[PDB]
Write a protein that binds this ligand. Structure first.
Ligand SMILES: [Zn+2]
Ligand SMILES: [Zn+2]
Ligand SMILES: [Zn+2]
Ligand SMILES: [Zn+2]
Lengths: 1266, 674
RNA sequence: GACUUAAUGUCACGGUACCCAAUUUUCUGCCCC
């Protein structure tokens, strides 16, 4: 009668469930499913605190299985005494059945017992089974048991604190994923009690017969798993945060900015990556200095207090919980409140796809099958343990439900009607210490999928079956056990954003933003895999070799849960495989407990320190020798690696990183954190890359537009090409994408360039100064392009058509149809080429004229011709009036596909300047280093990326934009209203010319062509690189040989054009072409010696005759739209545009000549790019002319139109060929500045000049002012 | 003065009515319901408690229609259908609790709730018990669910109440005179209200006759079989003929379609066939002076057994299936699946030569096996052509199934070393089927054909051992040839060539003597052969040998394949592409049968690739049942003289001394009938 | 000791929170009473 006290300790997060008795157990599916788990019973009436325990019946069952296995391995005898087969059948008629039925194969041997076991004499196996004792099933009565396994109590709670369920357990959800489709069929919930604190259990085992001591102790040492975890058995404040978040949300509501709460919660949870200094030291962005209203997010008045100050107060109040917890819960509460008030975007909520299947409680009545399994005598049973490291080659993601929804105990239930508002924010599974965790659930699911692939045949896992599945996959997993592993890294995860672009408008869908938390790339998780069997299968070794990374393997362990965007491709490292000889060295296995919970030491020890009975496995065949690997696993996913040469700035536009980083700037490039080994820490410099989501979406859009599948009403049950090779709600994708990491990054010495844009008012001609924004993209240049080395994976099974579609998408990317990142319409992220790696892909490698000019001539010789003798004076800028006739198309041309009748291609044109060109590089204010001697002097250089001059694509795009809008009578897109005169310029202009708000009322030809808000334009411009011409303008003198000190550029006052309230807005302001830069060039000494030296600007200029070449990529244009665009680009002889700074001084007169035009289409023969002849261009221009005539009411004559004549007069260069012509254009002097009449002293007087005449003179181009 | 809520509800109701048109395609119906339910939910988003009752009625109707548009993926009711019905029940509960006061709205609400609840009880008994449904139906009929002339749902309510033992005496005349009453519904009313057996029988004969033209996926099939089950449970005498009539209707319906021999799974087909078999067997247990009627009854029993054993399984495999491939093959699947799904949804939306059983050559005796779960005990029907007589015997298969499962579990781990369990299984077969060794049941020296039922396909019936102290092997006295069903038998009228073909794609190191040192020379043989080589056989030879370990699909028998090169040839590709094997003996050695089918769970409708060879015209397939060492099948192939005579002397009768020798000799069986 | 088991029968390591979504559209760093 030895009372053995037993200590049970766990090494993985085990599972526990509510007890619910036995009769009441059958009512609940969760308790019936979790009969093999630990049991939780409440103590108080509040259902908050209770006691955890493990039933002695479950421990007895595990020990009985251990005895069975131990006797089977030793041929039915332990320590020399033979044991019979025991009994595992209970006859219904003779007595009651056991509360648990086996439903499992039973190990058996060849008897060998001398006599049948009876009450007088029983074998140790029969003694341990408790067959011939005084205790049965009908009643407990008392301790008549020959062997009694008492109830196992949680030893960790060694206090009277009455531990709560939340402290010990955490709810989790687990899927059953369909192998064929990749989508989960159903799921179930469970509670995971942490083994770190509450992971030890104490119980007593009372054995009366001394004949079974050795067998019982050995079985205690041999049982390995219990309650869902590996184990060894030894014989010895939120409420205040929620209220404040509600207050913040209400303040945002009264500020009418509720949609900003999502990004506010995201940013607040992002501050956890930084320190406490972002709040304590006020390191948050302060916004633009000229904004005059503070930051758009951090300066929202929360009940009379700035949001930054409110956050500081909240941190001062809640510093007890910690910075990470405070930010996390504040963001979580804000997100939950936002979801509660606003939810539902895609309405994927007719029926909740969630299914709570629990294997139907394994309910059955008429099977009771006993299946004896007798291993052959003399067979060898060995256990192979594989120890390694799971290095994440890509940022992983293991999903978990929302912490507010898990809440073990009072868990959230989807039984409520209208199961909608599915969470748009997803968290990553983490340990209780914020350590990244790879659960053995997901690892085992991935292993099962890979073994099913390797075998080539397997079953979908059936639940509640009465017979063990005998498929080859299920046989191996029944003898394969793993371990839950966490990393030694606890820093918060990066949050990665995705959007849904509306194919009709190529713009973000409203409410499509959703986020996930990803672990850093490069983390290594411990890997443990054990296989107890008679022979290591070729399929398991094939799967390990598939997972293992080598010189040319890269590892293919697709763990995690977002493999479509390339998240969770792990790689086995430091693989060491050891084996136990369970037939001859099982005492050593029991003594060492199978190295359970000590696998880290096993991985980090030499062969000389191995425990006795454990030897390395020297028969692990290589990849080239495994048959399942070569035929089934190797060709499953084929990678296509390539590098993208981006000869333009690249802006992936991280959003929240611009709200938390102290740079105080609008848009910054996306970068990610990468973990490093050997010096274990996050790498100090983040790596710039294009998201795998952006890459995947780009290819998906390309394929959908090519096939026309994009833009379908829905893909709920679609089997189109795009759904087939990119997946849908009911099927996982067959192609997986990874990040386009920047490799050519340390060859710049300034990786990111600061480019700041601004929007120019159409009427005043000056910048708005409130819409000014600055982008901060990577400094990609045509001569030094950015190299983005990415890859994607293709599943085996694509036909010729699908592989051709993928190749066509890649070819489109190479051709530059789809630029990477934001602001692609102004030359950002333009792909200049591609270089497919020649190692992996083979089929992909196998699957890859005269001058044009316009002869139109516009005379415009009314006034300047008579001035050939002594010249006249013309006011620098005139206005164009086109009336209220604005034609808006409600049937806008969308972006779903390439319409057959619509032109698409690329215009290659060259730009030559007729006057010195000024394009300031406003990245720095002292580019010329002249501010040291001259204080407050604006010094600029010509715009350049990596030290080579070029014109920004935004400049050319805006200049063509205003030219086209003035030509086609489009509305004032960038009119600046809300300005007073001393109507407020709101009612001053007609409603027709106001900017278009939405797509309902229609879009102007300019707004339809170049695009407006929530409608991407169909014309994209690129940066104009420098080719030929003199490098600079010399201007020998007191200048640094390439710079000029321009005169004062005062703000355009909108009062000269509108002297009286009755007077209306004249129209668009244009600048005449003249040689007025000569007076500035010659008066260099007399311009910086005057008063006010701070308002002058010194900047680099280059001489006339410089050649800039840029591309104008157009797409889905109408027959006449292309002609109008060509006319805008090259309006003929003696007509040029104005570009850059100093337009009123005559600087920046650029002539654009269309070097060539190309056009591509879709044909069954896969027609490539083809260049149109001169006849087609002439036809397009003519048809655009007829379209203009139709709007109004062989060689085209544009001056016949009343307003096009004025436009071409405004843009007419008089000095192109007329040597005698040289008009003088100057701004009239205010009073006594340079009189060498024409003075503001008498120009507004009614007697001198009436208002009605001066307004008319401003609207007539080239009107003399004397 | 309509509002936005009223006009949106009207639009949703119009969409629901359009989706309630029986002419609507099932694929468009799903999108229509999604649109209507999206509208209704959008209204409910703003009026969680202020929503009008009629909108709640529309939501409940839409959820009911969602539930009826969800088909069972497998052999169990999907949880999505239950969830849809539950959501509709909750919405209609909120409709009822918000007492609008309108009598018509209350009647409509209770009708919708009762319909949802009867369907929910039909698919889930536990959550919607009989007592709760009875109380709800009583409340509905109290509320005014009496008009059977306009609403078929009210007729459904009345019939469901009749099924629940509730007195519908008052409404019987209205139910009968209603033009929308179904034939089965009228029969149930006659049997339950008036208890008029004669009228019910003569009126349900019409329903059974009309069932011929309705696909088995229709609701009326399930309801009819459930009515037969209820009649059998009530011990009514009407079920005996009803089961036979419905079985005949099922034969007529099944024979109309299915050129590739597949049927629709509806979970009551097996119950229907079991009841028909039991009814015919009970009719065969009467005292008739003439034996002709008894012989006809036993022949009918064999017909019932054979008609069930020649079709296939669940629908998720039908959806997945294979791409276009053969234009003839894919068209049949598309038509069958479309018509079956359309019939299933319409049920709820208003509204070569086949040899006869007696065509057996002289000197041959055939045995038909049938296991019915309702009776729970097996049947063996034998036909002796020489005596031209039919007789049947009974046996129990529960312990036999347990022993077979034991052998299967042991084999899947210790293949060669599990011979003792094979001997135990053979002894169990001999003990549980003593009629196989009875002279009266099977005459001595007769060539026996076996048509095994589901898990008896896996039993070595030729290797059964008689239950005697010195029991003789069944193989020693009779020549056994197996066959999945009698309908697979054909006539050996094909022309046999003079060449032998030896395909091979097995792993290197085996069969090297056969390939290089061709014993019979071979003409169009190959090494590392692909599916194209099998498809390129033009002249049908006397012997085609295929040596490639195949694979199985646990769900779709059409996807079981022989692992030849270029992806291997699958079960369906054999039917479409292979043509040149008319009357060709096959010694297919694809590393045992077990590779090609899944592992059984007393349901083995899965058919190996051998029956595909039988379908394409092969005269016989001499395969292997369980994996054996390669020299055994090599010696079988080298046995070129033209099976039990080989097994008798090779060592097949040596189970007493060397079970391993018995293991690898009994593994060979001949599939096909001369 | 109860909370808290039943005993000749617990594959729950018997189930991957899994599946679909381009942070992007639009904006000349411009200029006179
Ligand atoms: Zn014993
Ligand atoms: Zn399986
Ligand atoms: Zn699609
Ligand atoms: Zn417009």
């Amino acid at each position: 009668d030895m009372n053995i006290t037993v200590e049970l300790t766990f090494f993985e997060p085990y599972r526990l469930v509510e007890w619910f008795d036995w009769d009441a157990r059958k009512k609940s599916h969760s308790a019936m499913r979790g009969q093999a788990f630990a049991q939780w019973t409440w103590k108080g009436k509040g259902r908050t605190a209770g006691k955890s325990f493990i039933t002695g019946t479950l421990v007895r069952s595990a020990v009985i299985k251990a005895v069975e296995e131990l006797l089977s391995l030793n041929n039915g005898k332990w320590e020399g005494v033979p044991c019979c087969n025991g009994s595992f059948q209970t006859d219904e008629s003779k007595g009651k059945k056991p509360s648990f039925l086996r439903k499992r194969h039973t190990l058996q041997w060849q008897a060998n017992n001398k006599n049948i076991c009876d009450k007088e004499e029983a074998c140790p196996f029969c003694i341990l089974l408790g067959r011939f004792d005084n205790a049965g099933k009908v009643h407990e009565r008392n301790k008549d048991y020959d062997i009694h396994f008492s109830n196992f109590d949680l030893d960790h709670k060694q206090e009277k604190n009455d531990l709560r369920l939340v402290d010990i357990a955490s709810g989790r959800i687990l899927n059953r994923v369909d192998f064929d489709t990749g989508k989960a069929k159903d799921y179930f919930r469970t509670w995971e009690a942490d083994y770190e604190t509450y992971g030890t259990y104490t119980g007593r085992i009372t054995l009366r017969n001394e004949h079974a001591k050795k067998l019982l102790l050995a079985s205690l040492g041999f049982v390995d798993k219990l309650c869902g975890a590996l184990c060894r058995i030894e014989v010895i404040h939120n409420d205040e945060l929620r209220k404040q978040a509600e207050v913040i949300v209400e303040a945002f509501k009264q500020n009418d900015k509720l949609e900003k709460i999502r990004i506010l919660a995201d940013a607040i949870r992002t501050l956890r990556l930084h320190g406490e200094g972002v709040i304590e030291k006020d390191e948050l962005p302060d916004g633009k200095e000229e904004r005059d209203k503070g930051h758009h997010l951090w300066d929202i008045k929360v009940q009379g207090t700035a949001l930054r100050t409110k956050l500081k107060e909240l941190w001062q109040s809640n510093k007890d919980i910690g910075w990470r917890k405070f930010t996390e819960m504040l963001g979580s509460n804000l997100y939950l409140i936002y979801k509660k008030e606003t939810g539902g975007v895609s309405t994927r909520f007719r029926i909740l796809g969630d299914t709570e299947y629990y294997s139907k409680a394994h309910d059955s009545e008429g099977s009771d099958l006993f299946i004896p399994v007798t291993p052959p005598e003399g067979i060898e049973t060995k256990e192979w343990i594989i120890v390694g490291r799971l290095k994440a080659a890509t940022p992983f993601y293991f999903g978990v439900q929302q912490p507010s929804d898990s809440i073990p105990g009072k868990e959230k239930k989807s039984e409520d009607s209208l199961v909608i508002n599915e969470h748009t924010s997803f968290n990553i599974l983490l340990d209780k210490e914020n350590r990244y965790r790879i659960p053995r659930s997901a690892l085992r699911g991935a292993l099962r999928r890979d073994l099913r692939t390797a075998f080539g045949s397997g079953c979908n896992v059936s639940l509640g079956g009465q017979i063990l599945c005998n498929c080859k996959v299920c046989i191996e997993m029944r003898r394969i056990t793993l371990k839950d592993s966490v990393s030694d890294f606890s820093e918060p995860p990066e949050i990665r954003y995705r959007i849904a672009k509306n194919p009709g408008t190529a713009t973000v869908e409203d409410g499509s933003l959703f986020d996930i938390e990803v672990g850093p790339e490069g983390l290594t998780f411990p890997f443990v895999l054990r296989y107890r069997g008679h022979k290591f299968p070729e399929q398991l070794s094939s799967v390990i070799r598939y997972w293992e990374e080598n010189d040319g393997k890269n590892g293919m362990a697709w763990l995690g849960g977002l493999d479509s965007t390339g998240k969770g491709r792990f790689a086995l490292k430091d693989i060491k495989i050891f084996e136990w000889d369970l037939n001859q060295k099982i005492n050593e296995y029991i003594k060492e407990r199978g190295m359970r919970g000590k696998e880290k030491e096993l991985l980090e020890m030499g062969e000389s320190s191995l425990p006795d009975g454990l030897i390395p496995y020297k028969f692990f065949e290589e990849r080239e020798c495994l048959f399942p690997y070569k035929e089934n696993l190797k060709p499953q996913w084929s990678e296509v690696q390539y590098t993208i040469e981006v000869g333009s700035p690249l802006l992936t536009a991280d959003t929240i990183s611009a709200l938390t980083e102290p740079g105080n700037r609008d848009a910054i490039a996306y970068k990610k954190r990468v973990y490093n080994d050997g010096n274990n820490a996050i790498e100090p410099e983040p790596r710039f890359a294009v998201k795998s989501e952006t890459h995947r979406g780009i290819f998906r859009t390309a394929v959908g537009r090519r096939t026309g599948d994009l833009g379908k009403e829905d893909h709920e049950d679609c089997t189109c090409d795009m759904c087939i090779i990119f997946g849908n709600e009911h099927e996982s994708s067959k192609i997986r994408f990874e990040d386009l990491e920047l490799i050519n990054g340390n060859e710049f010495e300034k990786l990111e360039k600061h480019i700041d844009h601004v929007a120019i008012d159409r009427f005043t001609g000056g910048a708005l100064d409130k819409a000014k924004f600055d982008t901060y993209p990577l400094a990609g240049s045509p001569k030094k392009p950015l190299k983005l080395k990415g890859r994607f994976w293709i599943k085996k099974g694509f036909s010729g058509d699908h592989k051709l579609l993928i190749t066509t998408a890649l070819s489109d990317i190479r051709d530059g149809l789809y630029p990477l990142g934001s602001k692609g319409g102004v030359g950002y992220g333009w792909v200049a080429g591609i270089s497919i790696d020649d190692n992996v892909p083979d089929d992909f490698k196998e699957m890859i004229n005269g001058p044009i000019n316009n002869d139109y001539v516009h005379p415009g010789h009314q006034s300047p011709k008579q001035d050939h003798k002594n010249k006249n004076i013309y006011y620098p800028h005139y206005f164009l009036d086109s009336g209220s006739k604005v034609y808006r198309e409600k049937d806008i041309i969308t972006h779903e596909e390439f319409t057959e009748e619509l032109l698409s291609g690329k215009i290659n044109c060259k730009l030559e300047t007729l006057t010195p060109l000024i394009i300031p590089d406003t990245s720095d204010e002292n580019g010329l280093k002249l501010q040291g001697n001259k204080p407050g002097h604006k010094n600029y250089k010509f715009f350049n990326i990596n030290g080579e001059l070029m014109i920004p694509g935004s400049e050319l795009r805006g200049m063509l934009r205003t030219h086209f809008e003035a030509l086609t009578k489009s509305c004032f897109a960038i009119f600046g209203e809300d300005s007073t005169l001393s109507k407020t310029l709101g009612g001053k202009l007609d409603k027709a010319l106001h900017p278009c708000t939405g797509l309902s009322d229609g879009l102007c030809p300019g707004c339809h062509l170049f695009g407006t808000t929530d409608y991407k334009g169909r014309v994209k411009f690129g940066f104009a690189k420098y080719e030929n011409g003199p490098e600079w303008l010399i201007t020998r003198g007191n200048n640094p040989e390439r710079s000029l000190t321009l005169g004062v550029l005062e703000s355009p006052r909108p009062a000269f054009s509108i002297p009286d309230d009755e007077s209306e807005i004249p129209g668009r302001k244009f600048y005449l072409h003249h040689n007025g830069w000569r007076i500035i060039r010659q008066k260099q000494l007399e311009i910086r010696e005057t008063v006010q030296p701070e308002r002058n600007v010194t900047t680099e200029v280059m001489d006339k005759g410089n050649v800039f070449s840029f591309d104008v990529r157009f797409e889905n244009l109408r027959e006449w739209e292309l002609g109008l665009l060509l006319q805008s680009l090259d309006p003929g002889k003696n007509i040029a545009h104005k570009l850059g700074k100093g337009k009123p001084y005559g600087f920046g007169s650029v002539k654009i000549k269309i070097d060539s035009l190309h056009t591509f289409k879709i044909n069954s023969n896969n027609d490539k790019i083809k260049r149109v002849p001169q006849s087609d261009i002439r036809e397009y221009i003519n048809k655009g002319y007829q379209k203009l005539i139709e709007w109004s009411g062989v060689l085209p004559q544009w001056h016949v139109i009343p307003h096009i004549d004025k436009l071409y007069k405004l843009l007419w260069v008089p000095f192109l060929n007329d040597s005698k012509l040289e008009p003088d254009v100057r701004y009239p002097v205010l009073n006594e500045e340079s009189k060498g009449d024409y003075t503001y002293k008498k120009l507004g007087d009614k007697d001198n000049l009436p208002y009605k005449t001066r307004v008319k003179g401003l609207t007539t181009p080239w009107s003399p002012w004397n | 003065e309509p509002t936005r809520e009223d006009i949106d509800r009207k639009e949703a109701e119009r969409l629901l009515d359009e989706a309630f048109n029986p002419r609507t395609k099932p694929v468009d119906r799903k999108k229509i319901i999604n649109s209507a339910l999206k509208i209704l939910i959008g209204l409910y988003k703003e009026k969680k408690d202020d929503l009008t009752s009629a909108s709640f009625i529309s939501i409940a109707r839409a959820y009911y229609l969602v539930s009826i548009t969800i088909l069972p993926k497998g052999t169990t009711i999907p949880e999505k259908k239950k969830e849809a019905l539950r959501k509709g029940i909750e919405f209609i509960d909120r409709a009822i609790n918000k007492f609008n006061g309108s009598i018509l709205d209350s009647q409509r609400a209770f009708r919708i709730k009762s319909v949802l609840s009867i369907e929910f009880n039909r698919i889930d008994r536990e959550k919607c018990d009989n007592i709760k449904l009875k109380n709800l139906l009583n409340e509905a009929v109290d509320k005014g669910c009496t008009d059977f002339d306009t609403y078929e749902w009210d007729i459904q309510i009345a019939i469901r109440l009749c099924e629940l033992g509730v007195d519908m005496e008052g409404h019987f005349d209205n139910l009968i005179k209603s033009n929308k009453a179904n034939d089965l519904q009228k029969a149930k009313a006659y049997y339950f209200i008036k208890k008029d057996d004669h009228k019910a029988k003569e009126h349900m004969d019409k329903c059974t006759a009309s069932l011929k033209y309705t696909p088995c996926s229709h609701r009326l099939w399930d309801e009819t079989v459930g009515f037969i089950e209820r009649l059998k449970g009530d011990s009514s005498t009407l079920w005996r003929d009803f089961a036979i009539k419905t079985y005949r209707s099922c034969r007529v319906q099944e024979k109309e379609t299915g050129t590739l021999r597949l049927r629709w799974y509806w979970s009551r087909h097996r119950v229907l066939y079991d009841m028909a078999f039991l009814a015919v067997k009970e009719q065969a247990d009467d005292e008739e002076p003439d034996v002709n009627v008894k012989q006809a009854k036993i022949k009918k029993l064999a017909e019932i057994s054979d008609s069930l054993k020649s079709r296939f399984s669940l629908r998720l495999s039908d959806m997945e299936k294979m791409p276009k491939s053969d234009d003839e093959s894919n068209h049949e699947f598309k038509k069958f699946l479309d018509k079956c799904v359309t019939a299933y949804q319409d049920g709820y939306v208003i509204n070569a030569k086949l040899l006869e059983l007696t065509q057996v050559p002289e000197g041959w005796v055939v045995v038909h096996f049938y296991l019915n779960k309702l009776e729970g005990m097996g049947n063996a029907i034998v036909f002796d052509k020489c005596a031209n007589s039919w007789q049947y015997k009974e046996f129990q298969y529960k312990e036999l199934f347990e022993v077979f499962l034991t052998w299967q579990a042991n084999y899947n781990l210790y293949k060669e070393n599990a011979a003792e369990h094979l001997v135990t299984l053979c002894k169990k077969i001999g003990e549980t089927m003593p009629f196989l060794f009875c002279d009266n049941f099977i005459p001595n020296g007769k060539d026996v054909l076996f048509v095994p039922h589901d898990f008896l396909h896996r039993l070595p019936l030729h290797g059964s051992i008689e239950n005697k102290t010195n029991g003789k092997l069944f193989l020693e006295n009779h020549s056994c040839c197996y066959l999945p069903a009698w309908s697979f038998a054909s006539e050996k009228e094909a022309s046999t060539s003079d060449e032998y073909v030896l395909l091979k794609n097995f792993d290197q190191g085996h069969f090297e003597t056969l390939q290089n040192n061709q014993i019979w020379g071979t003409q169009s043989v190959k090494d590392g052969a692909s599916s194209d080589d099998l498809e390129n056989i033009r002249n049908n030879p006397r012997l085609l040998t295929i040596l490639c370990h195949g694979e199985a699909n646990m769900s779709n028998p059409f996807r079981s394949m022989l692992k030849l090169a270029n992806g291997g040839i699958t079960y369906l590709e054999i039917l479409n592409s292979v043509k040149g094997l008319k009357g060709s003996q096959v010694i297919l050695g694809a590393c045992e049968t077990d590779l090609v089918p899944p592992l059984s769970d007393v349901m083995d409708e899965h058919y190996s690739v051998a029956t595909a060879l039988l379908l394409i015209g092969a005269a016989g397939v001499v395969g292997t049942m369980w994996k054996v060492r390669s020299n055994k099948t090599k010696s079988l192939i080298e046995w070129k003289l033209e099976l039990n005579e080989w097994q008798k002397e090779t060592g097949g009768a040596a189970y007493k001394d060397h079970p391993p020798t018995f293991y690898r000799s009994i593994a060979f069986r001949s599939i096909g009938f001369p």
